[PDB]
Amino acid sequence: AQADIALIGLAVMGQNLILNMNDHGFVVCAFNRTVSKVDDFLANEAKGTKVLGAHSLEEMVSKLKKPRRIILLVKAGQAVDNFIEKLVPLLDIGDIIIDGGNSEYRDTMRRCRDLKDKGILFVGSGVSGGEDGARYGPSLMPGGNKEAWPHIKAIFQGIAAKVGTGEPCCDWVGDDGAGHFVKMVHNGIEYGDMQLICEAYHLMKDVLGLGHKEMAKAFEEWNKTELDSFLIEITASILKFQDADGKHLLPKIRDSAGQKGTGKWTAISALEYGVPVTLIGEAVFARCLSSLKDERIQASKKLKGPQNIPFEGDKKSFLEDIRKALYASKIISYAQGFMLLRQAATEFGWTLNYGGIALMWRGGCIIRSVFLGKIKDAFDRNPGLQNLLLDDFFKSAVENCQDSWRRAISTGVQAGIPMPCFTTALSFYDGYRHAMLPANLIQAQRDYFGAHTYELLAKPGQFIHTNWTGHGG
Amino acid sequence: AQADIALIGLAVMGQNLILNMNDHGFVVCAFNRTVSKVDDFLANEAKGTKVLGAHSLEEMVSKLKKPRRIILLVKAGQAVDNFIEKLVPLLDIGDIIIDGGNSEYRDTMRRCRDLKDKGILFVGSGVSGGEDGARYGPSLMPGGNKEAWPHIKAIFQGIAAKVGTGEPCCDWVGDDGAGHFVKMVHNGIEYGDMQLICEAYHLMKDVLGLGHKEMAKAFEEWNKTELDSFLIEITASILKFQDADGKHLLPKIRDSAGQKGTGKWTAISALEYGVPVTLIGEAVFARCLSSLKDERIQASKKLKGPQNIPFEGDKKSFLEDIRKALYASKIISYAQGFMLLRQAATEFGWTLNYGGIALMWRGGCIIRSVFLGKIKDAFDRNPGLQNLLLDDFFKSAVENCQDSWRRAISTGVQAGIPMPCFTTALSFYDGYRHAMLPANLIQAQRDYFGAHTYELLAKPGQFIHTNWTGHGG
Numbered sequence: 001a002q003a004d005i006a007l008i009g010l011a012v013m014g015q016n017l018i019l020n021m022n023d024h025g026f027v028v029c030a031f032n033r034t035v036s037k038v039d040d041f042l043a044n045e046a047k048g049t050k051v052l053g054a055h056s057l058e059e060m061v062s063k064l065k066k067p068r069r070i071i072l073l074v075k076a077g078q079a080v081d082n083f084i085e086k087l088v089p090l091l092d093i094g095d096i097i098i099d100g101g102n103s104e105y106r107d108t109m110r111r112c113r114d115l116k117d118k119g120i121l122f123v124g125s126g127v128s129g130g131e132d133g134a135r136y137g138p139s140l141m142p143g144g145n146k147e148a149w150p151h152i153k154a155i156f157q158g159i160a161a162k163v164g165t166g167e168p169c170c171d172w173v174g175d176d177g178a179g180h181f182v183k184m185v186h187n188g189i190e191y192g193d194m195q196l197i198c199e200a201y202h203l204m205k206d207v208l209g210l211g212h213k214e215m216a217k218a219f220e221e222w223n224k225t226e227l228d229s230f231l232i233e234i235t236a237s238i239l240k241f242q243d244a245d246g247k248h249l250l251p252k253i254r255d256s257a258g259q260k261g262t263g264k265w266t267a268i269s270a271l272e273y274g275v276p277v278t279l280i281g282e283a284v285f286a287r288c289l290s291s292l293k294d295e296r297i298q299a300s301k302k303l304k305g306p307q308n309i310p311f312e313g314d315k316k317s318f319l320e321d322i323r324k325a326l327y328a329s330k331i332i333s334y335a336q337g338f339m340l341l342r343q344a345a346t347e348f349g350w351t352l353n354y355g356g357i358a359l360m361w362r363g364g365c366i367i368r369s370v371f372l373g374k375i376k377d378a379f380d381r382n383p384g385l386q387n388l389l390l391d392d393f394f395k396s397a398v399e400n401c402q403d404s405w406r407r408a409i410s411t412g413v414q415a416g417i418p419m420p421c422f423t424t425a426l427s428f429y430d431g432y433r434h435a436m437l438p439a440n441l442i443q444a445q446r447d448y449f450g451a452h453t454y455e456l457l458a459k460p461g462q463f464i465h466t467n468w469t470g471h472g473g
Numbered sequence: 474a475q476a477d478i479a480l481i482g483l484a485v486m487g488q489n490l491i492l493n494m495n496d497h498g499f500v501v502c503a504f505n506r507t508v509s510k511v512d513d514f515l516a517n518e519a520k521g522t523k524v525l526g527a528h529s530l531e532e533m534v535s536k537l538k539k540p541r542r543i544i545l546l547v548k549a550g551q552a553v554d555n556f557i558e559k560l561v562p563l564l565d566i567g568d569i570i571i572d573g574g575n576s577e578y579r580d581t582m583r584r585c586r587d588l589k590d591k592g593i594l595f596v597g598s599g600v601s602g603g604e605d606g607a608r609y610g611p612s613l614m615p616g617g618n619k620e621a622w623p624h625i626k627a628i629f630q631g632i633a634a635k636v637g638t639g640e641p642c643c644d645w646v647g648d649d650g651a652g653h654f655v656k657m658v659h660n661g662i663e664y665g666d667m668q669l670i671c672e673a674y675h676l677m678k679d680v681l682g683l684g685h686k687e688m689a690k691a692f693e694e695w696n697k698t699e700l701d702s703f704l705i706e707i708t709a710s711i712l713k714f715q716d717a718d719g720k721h722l723l724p725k726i727r728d729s730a731g732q733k734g735t736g737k738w739t740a741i742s743a744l745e746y747g748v749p750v751t752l753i754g755e756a757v758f759a760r761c762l763s764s765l766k767d768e769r770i771q772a773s774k775k776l777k778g779p780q781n782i783p784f785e786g787d788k789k790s791f792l793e794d795i796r797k798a799l800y801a802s803k804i805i806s807y808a809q810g811f812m813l814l815r816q817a818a819t820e821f822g823w824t825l826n827y828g829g830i831a832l833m834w835r836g837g838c839i840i841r842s843v844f845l846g847k848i849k850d851a852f853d854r855n856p857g858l859q860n861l862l863l864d865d866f867f868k869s870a871v872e873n874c875q876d877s878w879r880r881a882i883s884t885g886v887q888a889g890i891p892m893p894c895f896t897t898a899l900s901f902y903d904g905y906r907h908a909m910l911p912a913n914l915i916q917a918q919r920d921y922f923g924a925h926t927y928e929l930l931a932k933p934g935q936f937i938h939t940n941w942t943g944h945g946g
């Protein structure tokens with residue numbers, strides 16, 4: 001018994017995590033099912049370290065100090081069950097299996113329970129940051145069977161990213177599939193930030209007639225304001241990047257965005273639990289829209305746009321307007337984000353700490369920014385805050401962006417620039433603001449052709465059906 | 474053996490369908506699990522008819538002429554399986570069970586298959602029209618095991634609604650859960666038309682400062698143009714309706730729209746199969762938004778809108794603009810609609826006839842309009858049409874609405890009127906029109922932090938990963 005923990009999965013991610021643990025002075029024993037890679041790694045990337053290698057699961061198992069704790073960094077689905085299947089014969093009661101892959105939260109729920117009756121503590125951690133992050137400090141969102149926590153605590157917390165105060169971007173998220181649900185919402189939001197930036201980019205390019213150099217200038221200027229964040233930083237870099245031949249690389253890239261399912265799942269869960277997360281949803285369908293590249297080429301030949309009117313206005317004011325519109329829409333996407341988190345917390349009975357979650361996304365992870373700090377502030381002042389838009393900072397932030405956000409959308413709209421996420425954020429803001437909505441008309445017509453029954457404004461609760469057919473006749 | 478068919482389920486729907494069949498001269502034997510209702514119906518609504526009553530399933534079963542065909546009009550889920558369970562012992566090979574309830578298409582797929590190995594022909598029909606329709610002529614969308622079709626054909630076709638040419642709004646849709654998938658897309662679209670009308674209503678009300686009388690005037694004027702349809706007709710009636718006390722009824726109704734899940738499922742399936750059906754999706758989230766009525770009241774007190782600028786323009790021109798914007802967005806929602814249908818057809822291997830489907834929605838059903846006729850035209854001229862927007866009628870229709878649709882959205886946007894479906898339809902139109910989209914930026918950043926790899930515009934197919942980190946350093 002010498003290894004404090006094991007990690008199974010030696011793709012770069014696993015590999016880097018093992019090293020990161022090693023630097024914090026934890027003896028890890030690695031394992032992988034194509035076992036040659038254990039040697040390959042010990043010889044190459046890991047030479048000089050304290051990491052032990054294992055050639056059999058039972059070897060890995062005997063290596064472990066108790067409580068045994070092993071991590072799975074294997075891609076999702078079937079694979080994780082199969083590893084689990086094998087590990088159970090070999091484990092004692094009180095032992096711990098961790099699933100770091102991007103697993104479906106219902107599978108984590110299943111596995112966690114099933115194992116608890118077998119006496120094994122199971123946790124599902126979301127891991128974020130990518131390779132870079134896995135090596136120096138990822139954010140780790142662990143949920144599942146709470147008993148496990150104190151045993152992995154010092155490890156998880158020690159290898160995580162920490163923001164300035166020294167806080168690790170990792171703490172116990174909650175029961176069952178909490179860690180893995182939070183993780184998919186993170187990615188859902190990640191989709192959202194990217195699409196907004198594309199929209200911001202599309203207005204500069206097509207309306208303002210800007211070039212990639214000034215565009216990167218603009219983005220790095222913006223990264224000095226409230227938009228200070230990782231995806232704004234990297235977009236500045238991406239826009240300046242000269243290919244081998246001198247030309248800019250970006251306009252050479254094919255416009256068919258991929259997705260490995262997480263953002264999609266976020267949108268499914270919102271539709272299932274009745275939460276209006278419109279911007280992540282628009283983002284997911286935007287990526288599907290970009291996949292019909294051949295259709296679009298065919299379409300551009302047949303479908304006309306607006307009459308061409310130039311932009312007779314000021315390039316730098318409008319550039320300011322685009323910044324505001326972006327910032328405002330970012331806030332909406334996050335409020336919709338934490339709404340879903342709240343609903344989930346109530347449908348599965350998890351006690352989520354939203355301020356904690358925000359801190360766990362302030363470092364390591366791809367959506368990291370200063371902005372998450374300002375969200376954290378909100379939930380410390382009020383853990384019970386019902387919607388983020390109600391917090392004074394954010395209500396002040398959006399009314400301050402009012403005129404610009406509506407100006408930008410409107411100009412975009414005349415020019416023919418597709419803005420799916422800028423528009424849903426404004427529609428949602430205007431929708432949520434109104435204490436009375438035309439949904440009454442919906443209720444009336446449902447009752448007309450389908451007799452579904454309706455409530456009155458006053459006397460909420462008693463249902464009526466009107467014979468509308470004729471008021472007589 | 475005297476009954477040509479049986480119907481199990483004596484809610485008004487079942488009841489009316491039985492009568493409708495009876496008028497076409499088919500002896501039906503009714504059954505229901507609270508058996509007293511069979512008497513209740515025979516004595517009351519059905520007295521004087523040819524309908525027989527049954528007190529035991531085995532009684533119902535012996536009543537039947539062969540091939541035995543019985544219809545289930547029971548609400549979905551568990552219930553339908555249980556009826557099925559019981560009917561199998563009692564049925565012979567070649568017998569037919571029909572499911573008219575709004576069942577999940579995956580359940581229809583399961584049941585259809587399972588039964589085929591038991592030798593029973595199973596069909597899932599979507600039924601639309603509501604009570605009214607079930608009595609004189611519903612639209613019936615039947616899918617499942619094709620063998621069944623010729624045996625029920627004359628019945629189904631005979632009791633269906635028929636449009637002017639004499640065509641029944643019913644024909645064989647296709648295999649497995651085709652009929653029930655089509656049905657849920659119908660409802661998805663139904664949601665879409667309603668939300669658009671609410672949006673149209675919200676601009677007249679809040680911007681144009683119109684009153685319910687002129688608003689109904691406007692809607693019935695519009696029902697004389699391309700918008701001639703059932704939901705426009707009934708909205709005219711709904712707006713004029715005076716309550717007991719003289720006042721208009723509509724503004725007394727609580728604005729929290731319900732949904733019995735179908736529209737939602739449509740949006741799930743689109744997210745699952747990667748189809749950008751943005752307007753039905755916006756519609757579903759709009760209904761969820763209206764359920765947070767208490768939140769909205771709380772929100773209106775804290776969240777500011779745009780600076781109040783009146784509408785200094787012309788009320789009747791703008792009213793024309795709203796009509797156009799509605800019509801245009803209707804077209805987009807339907808194109809997105811038939812896209813999903815096409816994708817489904819390809820993922821399950823159904824040979825859907827889209828012109829047929831359109832005819833099946835031109836009568837009986839809630840979304841019926843003249844508009845469906847013009848869609849039918851498109852798929853007759855070209856069964857292979859890839860997207861409805863490419864058809865000459867519709868491309869001409871939308872460019873004709875260009876200026877008004879963008880004018881209306883823009884004014885809405887300044888005024889603070891929530892338009893989620895008007896905006897996604899314009900964003901989608903502008904998105905689909907562009908042969909090149911900023912999705913390239915998405916692809917570039919995914920490759921940056923996650924190494925996902927990208928394609929080049931030219932040389933579509935070979936994947937590259939750039940070390941962006943520093944172009945040196």
Ligand SMILES: NC(=O)c1ccc[n+]([C@@H]2O[C@H](COP(=O)([O-])OP(=O)(O)OC[C@H]3O[C@@H](n4c(Br)nc5c(N)ncnc54)[C@H](OP(=O)(O)O)[C@@H]3O)[C@@H](O)[C@H]2O)c1
Nearest residue numbers: 009010011012013032033034073074075079100101102130
């Ligand atoms: N760039 C990165 O490194 C990166 C970025 C973002 C996220 N991730 C995270 O790391 C996780 C896994 O790494 P990846 O993204 O490269 O995904 P992969 O799909 O490449 O997963 C690689 C691992 O899965 C193991 N595995 C497979 Br594949 N099938 C297995 C099976 N049937 N039984 C047992 N083990 C099996 C492989 O073992 P083998 O190699 O012996 O086949 C390998 O260790 C992801 O789910 C995600 O959480 C990684």
Ligand SMILES: NC(=O)c1ccc[n+]([C@@H]2O[C@H](COP(=O)([O-])OP(=O)(O)OC[C@H]3O[C@@H](n4c(Br)nc5c(N)ncnc54)[C@H](OP(=O)(O)O)[C@@H]3O)[C@@H](O)[C@H]2O)c1
Nearest residue numbers: 482483484485486505506507546547548552573574575603
């Ligand atoms: N206004 C309308 O009539 C209308 C409008 C729109 C759609 N629909 C359509 O008609 C269908 C059913 O009518 P509905 O909308 O009133 O829905 P309901 O949920 O009221 O379904 C009523 C039927 O379900 C039967 N049933 C139930 Br409930 N539980 C059952 C069980 N456990 N085992 C066997 N049978 C069971 C009832 O028998 P019991 O009465 O003996 O309990 C009754 O015949 C819907 O799914 C839909 O397709 C009707």
